[PDB]
Design a protein around this nucleic acid. Sequence first.
RNA 1: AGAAGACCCUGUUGAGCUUGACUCUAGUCUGCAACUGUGAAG
RNA 2: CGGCCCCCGGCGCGGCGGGACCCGGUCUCCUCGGAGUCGGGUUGUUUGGGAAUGCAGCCCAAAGCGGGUGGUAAACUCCA
RNA 3: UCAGACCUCAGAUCAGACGCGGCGACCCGCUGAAUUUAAGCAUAUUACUAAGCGGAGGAAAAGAAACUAACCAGGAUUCCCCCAGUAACGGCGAGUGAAGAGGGAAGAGCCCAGCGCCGAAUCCCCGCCCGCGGGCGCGGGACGUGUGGCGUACGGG
Lengths: 38, 203, 50, 61, 147, 199, 98
Amino acid sequence: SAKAKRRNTTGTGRMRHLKVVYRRFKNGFREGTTPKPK
Amino acid sequence: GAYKYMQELWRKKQSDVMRFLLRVRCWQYRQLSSLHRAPRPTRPDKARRLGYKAKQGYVIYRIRVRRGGRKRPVPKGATYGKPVNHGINQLKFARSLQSVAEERAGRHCGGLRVLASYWVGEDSTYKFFEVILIDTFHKAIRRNPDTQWITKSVHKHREMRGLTSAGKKSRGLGKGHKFHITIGGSRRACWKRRNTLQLHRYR
Amino acid sequence: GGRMFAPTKTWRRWHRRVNTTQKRYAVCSALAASALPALIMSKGHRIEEI
Amino acid sequence: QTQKENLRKFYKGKKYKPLDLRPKKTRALRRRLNKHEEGLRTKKQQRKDRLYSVRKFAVKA
Amino acid sequence: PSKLRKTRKLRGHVSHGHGRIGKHRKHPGGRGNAGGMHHHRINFDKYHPGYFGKVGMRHYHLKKNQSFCPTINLDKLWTLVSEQTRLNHAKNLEGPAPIIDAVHAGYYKVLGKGKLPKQPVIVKAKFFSRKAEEKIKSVGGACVLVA
Amino acid sequence: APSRNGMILKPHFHKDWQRRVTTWFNQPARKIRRRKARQVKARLVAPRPVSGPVRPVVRCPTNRYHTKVRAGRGFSLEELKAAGINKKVARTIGISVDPRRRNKSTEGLQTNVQRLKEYRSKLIVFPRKPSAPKKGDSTAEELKLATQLKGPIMPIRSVYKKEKARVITEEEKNFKAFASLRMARANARLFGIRAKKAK
Amino acid sequence: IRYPMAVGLNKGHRVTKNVTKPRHCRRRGRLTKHTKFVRDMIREVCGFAPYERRAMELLKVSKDKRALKFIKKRIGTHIRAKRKREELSNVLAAMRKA
RNA sequence: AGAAGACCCUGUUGAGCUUGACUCUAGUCUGCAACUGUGAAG
RNA sequence: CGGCCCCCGGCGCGGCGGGACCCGGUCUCCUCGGAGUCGGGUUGUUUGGGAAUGCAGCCCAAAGCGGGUGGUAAACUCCA
RNA sequence: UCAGACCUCAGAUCAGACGCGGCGACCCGCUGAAUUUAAGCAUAUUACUAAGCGGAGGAAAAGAAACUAACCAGGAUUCCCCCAGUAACGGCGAGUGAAGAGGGAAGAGCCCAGCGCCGAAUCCCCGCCCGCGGGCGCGGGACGUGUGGCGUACGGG
Ligand SMILES: [Mg+2]
Ligand SMILES: [Mg+2]
Ligand SMILES: [Mg+2]
Ligand SMILES: [Mg+2]
Ligand SMILES: [Mg+2]
Ligand SMILES: [Mg+2]
Ligand SMILES: [Mg+2]
Ligand SMILES: [Mg+2]
Ligand SMILES: [Mg+2]
Ligand SMILES: [Mg+2]
Ligand SMILES: [Mg+2]
Ligand SMILES: [Mg+2]
Ligand SMILES: [Mg+2]
Ligand SMILES: [Mg+2]
Ligand SMILES: [Mg+2]
Ligand SMILES: [Mg+2]
Ligand SMILES: [Mg+2]
Ligand SMILES: [Mg+2]
Ligand SMILES: [Mg+2]
Ligand SMILES: [Mg+2]
């Protein structure tokens, strides 16, 4: 049942954390640092 | 120089010394559960011969598997179809009983990776094996460059993919005319390449 | 909302191969045709004062 | 943000940090070998790299 | 080009070129080579004789590189050397004879279908036909066997 | 299904072949990808040739090809020993080593020994530390005329040498080539049946 | 008068054979002085297999043909059977002297 | 009017069921070696 | 083969800090290997593999100038 | 043993780690059909396919010969071209069907156990002290039922 699989697969919902990993991957998963202040 | 004698000693399995050691142990091993940890390899020379070392992180698990073939699990032995598939009793599983021992030893211990396995006893209904597992997150394993290869994420559950010594044998791998069926990695990789219609652009 | 008759397959033979001798033949003819004033004007180019 | 900064300063350079102070990169990344572990070579390989490393050379023709 | 297809002229014709009495069904005679002995025997025996049955010995592991023996006749024997090689030696027929290595040109056996130019020549090959050797010995040449 | 005179065809399309059909629409992009990868690999080993190590001259096995030669995997340990090159030092200077290959004849043995002695004559070995050269390191004047070699190192060519034309002797004219082949087949076929009669 | 032919007894392109020492992989399975000492110690401690004693009893009663057919049925091929029958005959010739 | 006759026949179209139909099969009976040791007697 | 600015990841050339660390060639002397596995029988399955291509169940069960392969079963023998 | 050691086997919300589920296009290990074709149909075919189950990674898998070959010899694996719809298989019917060689893409090779030499020469943990690594412990363990160095068939010492 391919139609039933694409109704509750990854992406059909909200992705509260996968949408962030996709953003963190573009920067190499940087943590512990901050942008340079003004 | 003791490991060489044990190698030749364990080859005389029909001798009065080994028959007694294989009779009392198979009794002792069948009075335990089908899966239990051993404090040390029953065959120290055989374990190291497969990659075992007396370090912190190496564990031994004895597995008891039911001998015999594979009965077709169909209701009332009725395989609805052509008479080719009417076989229920005389069916043999594709993998060996030693491969099933590592699959059960590795599934119960998800935090460990199966390294190797060896035969320790037989019976009319039981085959006893000892599976060598490793704790790939122990510092005695991650700091030794000779064993860091198993700590990689590509070796997750090798026994489930037939990468161990006993599970790789049932795949038909090898060089020569005997193994033309697995040319190109696996059997399904070879079959997929042998049945792919290559349509070039300027064909 | 159904399926079209004979859905277009991606493995259609898009590309045609021509012989190297014919590919060079066509160039020798297109160059020889670029040397005649009648064919260049009949093509439409404005060469009436070149 | 102020208390979280003081907690990281308190657990700075300690072997066991709280789970909210440890880096959260990826479950796969946190289970890799360290930079020191992946750079460790056995004493047998250290001799083969010292003696039989690929030289820099050129060929005339 | 679908502009030249027969379907473009059958637009408007009901049966589309397949008859009204016997329609174009799916497989009114089977699929593939079906019925080669039952209802297509007449077509098979008439146009494909010898199709059914076994003949000859079986060879399990046939490596065609063992029986690799390309042949060349005598009417094309001088094509393995330049034209000047034949012309320079045609002037001095009693002097040295040119050597034609057939194995180097990719021919292991020399046959004798054609005639040979009236001048001696040293032919080097692995195998020689009987008539191929006669026409070389008669013209003044000699046959050399190469392993 | 059959018709007037034709050919009995064998279309191997009785499976789900359309599920497994590999098209080559990425062939032009693959040609650029490999071309780009060779350019990146060339910059990695900048002085060293882009092709890699040196391949020996080997004879093709079967009768269909035992007349020509090609490029093998690596030089035999016997050829490295005859050329005075250590098995482990050879791989450092870009020499392919094949511990499996044998040498049943001296023709192929001396073929690569010459090829292996000629390659070391063209070597320009840079010092391990540029500020202090060593014995095996080339002189600074030779290190300047050192460019990256493009293509395979010492391409294997088989230049055919002409057999010198000679006057045909009477022994060559009297040699029966056809009789010598038919009798060779009989003597090789009846060799075993005659060896029993001698007992 | 005598050319190298591609067919016959002396077939093949004539080349000078390069004779060297055999590669080290060829000595595999060669009885060293320690392996013989270790295997003879295991023979003293372990003894013989049940099918070996059954065969040694057939050899001492001059039934070598039935002993060979018994060993071949137990050990497998005919080549392995003769090598085992000769070994079991040597130990019988050894215990007669001792 | 409502329904591509359920009656009949055709199809090298099925299904339900049945047997002394063809070919198999779960189960069951039986034999062999293995698990299987110790001793006496005929 | 445009400028400017803020970052990121490399490579090359130098020195600094901490870690490794003697290699070759001859002779002599000495040393050298993986077992309920190979293999045989049988069964089922698989394969173009056909007196058995692979795999597996059960029984049998190795040898060490051995063992495996040499596309037809087998014995003797030679060879690779 | 100042009388307890060892072996085997337990308990803990013990100290510190790990496993679980998702995705599953590609990939690995199993399992496994029938429509369909044979103008019926039973082996065959469909197909070592779909569906079913397990396990990963950015690739996987395979991979350094118990190989091919029978040559004037080749030399890990993977992929492309060719071999070839060929050898072979098959109610020898329908159908099925590779490999050696040859040409290319890419090329990188290595490590143990055993054997015997080296005063276990080896390793983890805690605490402290230095700049995730380092020293220090007359700290606690693992380990002789075998850790480390040398060394692996191309021989090695
Ligand atoms: Mg692997
Ligand atoms: Mg639509
Ligand atoms: Mg070591
Ligand atoms: Mg009309
Ligand atoms: Mg109509
Ligand atoms: Mg009609
Ligand atoms: Mg039609
Ligand atoms: Mg017609
Ligand atoms: Mg026609
Ligand atoms: Mg009707
Ligand atoms: Mg009819
Ligand atoms: Mg019904
Ligand atoms: Mg089949
Ligand atoms: Mg999962
Ligand atoms: Mg049908
Ligand atoms: Mg039909
Ligand atoms: Mg599926
Ligand atoms: Mg990649
Ligand atoms: Mg891999
Ligand atoms: Mg098939």
